[PDB]
């Protein structure tokens, strides 16, 4: 059983790396586009007031 837990921890390493990669992609390429969308929405609100 102690032999098997070792392999479990190694597979957990393998999943941790992908978690890091996904977080990095989200930070680098998804957030600024959402910021651009929000910038586009505020002006639409102003036009609706007009």
């Amino acid at each position: 059983a102690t032999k098997a837990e070792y392999a479990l921890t190694k597979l957990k390493l393998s999943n941790e790396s992908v978690t890091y990669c996904t977080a990095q992609y989200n930070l680098s390429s998804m957030l600024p586009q959402q910021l651009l969308m929000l910038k586009n929405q505020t002006t639409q609100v102003a036009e609706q007031t007009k």
Binding site: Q44, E47, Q48, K50
Partner: protein, 50 residues
């Protein structure tokens, strides 16, 4: 589209303003379509009298 509808609403407002007052907001005479109707009405009154 919202800016374009902003531009259209002013024309609707003036076209419906023409139903109560002769002058058109900024201070010009109504001169299209409605003016001809008013001229026809005046001519009809004079023809009645004659």
């Amino acid at each position: 589209l919202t800016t374009e509808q902003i531009n259209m609403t002013k024309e609707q407002k003036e076209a419906q303003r023409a139903q109560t007052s002769d002058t058109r907001t900024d201070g010009t005479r109504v001169a299209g379509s409605v003016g001809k109707q008013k001229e026809l009405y005046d001519q009809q009154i004079t023809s009645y009298k004659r």
